[model samples]
Target chain A: ASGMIVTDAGADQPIVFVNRAFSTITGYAPNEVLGRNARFLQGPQTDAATVARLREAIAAARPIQERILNYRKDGQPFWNQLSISPVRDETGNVVAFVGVHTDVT
Target chain B: ASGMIVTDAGADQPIVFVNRAFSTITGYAPNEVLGRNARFLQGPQTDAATVARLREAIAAARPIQERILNYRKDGQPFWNQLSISPVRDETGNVVAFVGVHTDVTA
Candidate 1:
């Protein structure tokens, strides 16, 4: 199973929704992670370069895929194959971001 | 990238959102699929048993995963690794469903 997350771009990109797979992969309950930035999943060992790329893509409202080290709620590290894309409204305005997380570890 | 789809369970499960990967995998634009059910991707070659299992799972508001044959907008057959889960509101009412699609054809 792959983790899927939806973040509201209209309001600072906080997580608005997550699926059951996300809980299994990250050990964070829906209530626990809601309204928080996904960066909370990162840790000391996470790749700074990958994070930079992610930021750049989001800033440009584009799509990006990267494999990076991420820590779960229990502080355990795993390789996360993360892909994110900007979801636009009918008028072509970015409204949300969809992120898919596959544990490639 | 894997295809991702969101359907509004409250409105008869019409597709509410789909990602760029979904358009790439199925050869359908977001506008073409927005108001249709994901079942449109199924064809004669799809497994009835798998379809039954999927229906049973969704009927019970449970998560399900399966590898089944699916067709693209261009009528090309491909192996789809589909995983779907119900999204509930604070009161435990299912309001939507999320489906993840991976093309295993390669």
Candidate 2:
């Protein structure tokens, strides 16, 4: 199973929810990172091109899949294969972004 | 006045040069992370908006300035104000990126 996160579309796309598998992969509890953006998982090893790709898709409210190196709460690094999609309201406006993360490292 | 890093514009923007202030600020020597990207300095406290801003500028071969929370080699966190610019060649194409980092945790 993959870890999941939902981020609010307003403002800076703050995290609204994180699933249990997300905590398991990143060693962060829900209460510990609620309302924060998911960039906290990135560390020195994360690739900029991959990050750029992800950001572009999220900014465009489109879907994207990328494999990026991410860091855990304890500073350990892992490869995270992420698939992200935009959530829409009834009026076809983007409301939220959902991301699924699978640990491949 | 700040730490400096130069990364190749090709591919993943791999680091090609780091100044002494960069090592002093982040506790990472040139030889330790020359071929790596600058994202290693990010930690759990970084804001996604700030990162996305920087990424977009780099993707467009432009310039950006943002303050962010970043981690050091010793696992300590600090506030970093970074200014990034694209390096262009004679052909008007980007060849690299230059970033200046200042510790602003105060």
Candidate 3:
């Protein structure tokens, strides 16, 4: 529950929901990233390999764990232990993805 | 950042607030603890003085530190190192409690 986001799996992973804890951690209000892809949280120092694994998880509808350099809204850098899990429907279709992150910085 | 979290100051101190580290340390799912009094985690062996200190803090809208007995979801007893502050909004009205706790059972 540190930071949770639900993104539409079919819509380029646009955010569909976010929790207050998420807002508190990243310093981003719901309006700022509510509909944006979570990738916007990355920055120049973000590792390419970490992002590659994240993208791989999304593309394959699987879960992946990675720690990446993430920037807060104020542009401060932090280490984020991120877990991205595919949210599947009752029929076994992935309808969305749940991204949970914690600041380890 | 170990077990950082927030809880509602509302009736019962229900966990309207949250933290990822909180669940990791407590082994109680957010959904299970949300909307319930934090007392649920306490068992027969919980130190009365520790709970008293936390109550004093909550009543005064101040922060408190204590070591108390807490139970994990598996019903195992452990020591929880806890420090909690009553959260106040911009208007200075007590609104919630936020704390960090870690399992220190040894």
Interface RMSD of every predicted model, in angstroms = 12.5, 19.3, 14.8
Model 1, residue pairs in steric clash: none
Q: How much of the real interface does each model capture, measured as fnat? A: 0.00, 0.00, 0.00
lDDT of each candidate versus the true structure: 0.82, 0.78, 0.73
Model 3 residue runs over 4 Å out of place are: A1-105
Q: Candidate 1 chain B: minimum summed lDDT over ten consecutive residues — where?
A: B87-96
Docking class for model 2 is incorrect
TM-score of chain A of each: 0.96, 0.96, 0.95
**lDDT of candidate 3?**
0.73
Per prediction, the TM-score for chain B is: 0.95, 0.95, 0.88
Model 2: lDDT equals 0.78
Count of clashes, each model? 0, 2, 1
TM-score of 3: 0.51
DockQ of each: 0.04, 0.01, 0.04
lDDT of 3 at A78: 86
**Tens digits of lDDT, candidate 1, A24-96:** 9999999999889999999998889999999989988988888989999999999998877775532356656
lDDT of 3 by residue, B45-94 (tens): 99888888888778787877778999888888988877676644323555
DockQ of 3: 0.04
TM-score, candidate 2, chain B alone: 0.95
